[PDB]
């Protein structure tokens, strides 16, 4: 069972320029000290990307934002996230997000990472939650409201248990994680990279190379996708359910892919130092 939470404010979105970033290894061959021209799906240099916040403030007027809207897929997705703690967990992919067609689910819940391909019925506002206890001084976690009906599952993968922090700090962001999602043939392909930063606002300008992470044989039809977040809940947020909660501090950026031609420059070990577009 799940509920709708309604104490949100209102504001239109924003746009931010992406600099020379978003390049990945396009095949499996190894080269060194070459200039190679490639044709593939890439993200254009100096292109609009869309900005999404999750920040709560009090004292001056009223400003509570918690955004996770349904967005189209088109040909592929480039995803970037900036956080001080762990606030983004995972994603739901599908074509109708109802009980008449299949869907894909990737979730982290502080003990195991779960990858499923199954028939579901997601409800309007999926979210995960935590609790802060004063007697313990411990950040214990108990909340999971993402679906209400799952059946006929085909693939299932549950991973090795691990530990993770859920504390939640204040200040400047100190992590950056980038993902690339592509769906081709009957295969789902995921690339990833991580880097440290010390910014306060907006996307860094630089260069990085992405490496392959996961290839899954699934065979679903994908047209839309949605994001899952985590929210806090403690003694300082009174009221009742659907009206008592607070947000953390996180942001993410999304962009799309197009057919382009690039001129990549390999190094003398096999690292892409820079690149140029036309």
């Amino acid at each position, epitope marked *: 069972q799940c509920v709708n939470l309604t104490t949100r404010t209102q504001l239109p979105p924003a746009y931010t320029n992406s600099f020379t970033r978003g390049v990945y290894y396009p095949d499996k061959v190894f080269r060194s000290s070459v200039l190679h021209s490639t044709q593939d799906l890439f993200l254009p240099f100096f292109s609009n990307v869309t900005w999404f916040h999750a920040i709560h403030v009090s004292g001056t007027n009223g400003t509570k934002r918690f955004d996770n809207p349904v967005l189209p897929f088109n040909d592929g997705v480039y995803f970037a996230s900036t956080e001080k703690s*762990n606030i983004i967990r995972g994603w739901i992919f599908g074509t109708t997000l109802d009980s008449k067609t299949q869907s894909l689910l990737i979730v*982290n819940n502080a003990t195991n*990472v779960v990858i499923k391909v199954c028939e579901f019925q997601f409800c309007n506002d999926p979210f995960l939650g935590v609790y802060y206890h004063k007697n313990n001084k411990s950040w214990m976690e108990s909340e999971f409201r993402v679906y209400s009906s799952a059946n006929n599952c085909t693939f299932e993968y549950v991973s*090795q248990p*691990f*530990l*993770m922090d859920l504390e939640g700090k204040q200040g400047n962001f100190k992590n950056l*994680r980038e993902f690339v999602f592509k769906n081709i043939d009957g295969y789902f392909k995921i690339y990833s990279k*991580h880097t*440290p930063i010390n910014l306060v606002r907006d996307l860094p300008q630089g260069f990085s190379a992405l490496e392959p992470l996961v290839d899954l044989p699934i065979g679903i039809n994908i047209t839309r996708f949605q994001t899952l977040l985590a929210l806090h809940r403690s003694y300082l947020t009174p009221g009742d359910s659907s009206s008592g909660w607070t947000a953390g501090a996180a942001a993410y950026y999304v962009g799309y892919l197009q057919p382009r031609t690039f001129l990549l420059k390999y190094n003398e070990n096999g690292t892409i130092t820079d690149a140029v577009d036309c």
Partner: T-cell receptor
Framework: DIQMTQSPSSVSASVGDRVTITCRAS??????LAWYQQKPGKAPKLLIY???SLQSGVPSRFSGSGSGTDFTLTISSLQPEDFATYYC?????????FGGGTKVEIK | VQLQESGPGLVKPSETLSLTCTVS??????????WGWIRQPPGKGLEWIGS?????????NPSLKSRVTISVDTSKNQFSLKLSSVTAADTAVYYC????????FGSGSYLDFDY
């Protein structure tokens, strides 16, 4: 409260042969385990993680299978540099526990 | 990446055992990983004594839990393990460790040791 027993001890082998070690659990761990090798006078180095995999550039003459309450390790052939003690460890609960170890020597 | 444990030599009965682990090649702060200590007595046997995380959240082995503490000095890349009281059977060889990181998301270490 997880207890293990390692049944072989002080196995003797020649240069080309096949040797096998079994590490038994007591609880119902599910396909999570680790194997370790200790050359004399050094610190242990990891060889196999999870049920069946390999990290880094360990030679591919090392491979083991898995189950829910039994486990094993076998090597295809020996070289004069394979002479040490091997260990098995769990990766499930908070009280981490280690095995008694088994010794492999070349004859 | 690279470690070099350090500490004293001969000790006295029922005293505090000092120790220090100077991490080299890695920022002890610019990480989200765990660190730990491991013991091996002469002869046969291995035991895990404690694991720590920077900025609090300490854990301890259920056996021999009364007299063990672990601290981290975030100013440098150093952490230490303290035993208030020792016995005649506490002599061994001690090792630092690093917990292997997570693969899909980052920000997490498994319950296994490498490096």
């Amino acid at each position: 409260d997880i207890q293990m027993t390692q049944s072989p001890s002080s196995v003797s082998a020649s240069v080309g042969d096949r040797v096998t070690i079994t590490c038994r659990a007591s609880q119902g761990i599910s396909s999570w385990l680790a194997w370790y090798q200790q050359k004399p006078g050094k610190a242990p180095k990891l060889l196999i993680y999870a049920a069946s995999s390999l990290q880094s550039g360990v030679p591919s003459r090392f491979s083991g299978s898995g189950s829910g309450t039994d486990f094993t390790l076998t090597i295809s052939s020996l070289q004069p540099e394979d002479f040490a003690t091997y260990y098995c460890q769990q990766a499930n609960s908070f009280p981490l526990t280690f095995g008694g170890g088994t010794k492999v020597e070349i004859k | 990446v690279q470690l070099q444990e350090s500490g004293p030599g001969l000790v006295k009965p029922s005293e505090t055992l000092s120790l220090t682990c100077t991490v080299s090649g890695g920022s002890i702060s610019s990480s989200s990983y765990y660190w730990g200590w491991i013991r091996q007595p002469p002869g046969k046997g291995l035991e895990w004594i404690g694991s720590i995380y920077y900025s609090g959240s300490t854990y301890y082995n259920p056996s021999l839990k009364s007299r063990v503490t672990i601290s981290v000095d975030t100013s440098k890349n150093q952490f230490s393990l303290k035993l208030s009281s020792v016995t005649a059977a506490d002599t061994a060889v001690y090792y630092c460790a690093r917990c292997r990181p997570e693969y899909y998301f980052g920000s997490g270490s498994y319950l296994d040791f490498d490096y």
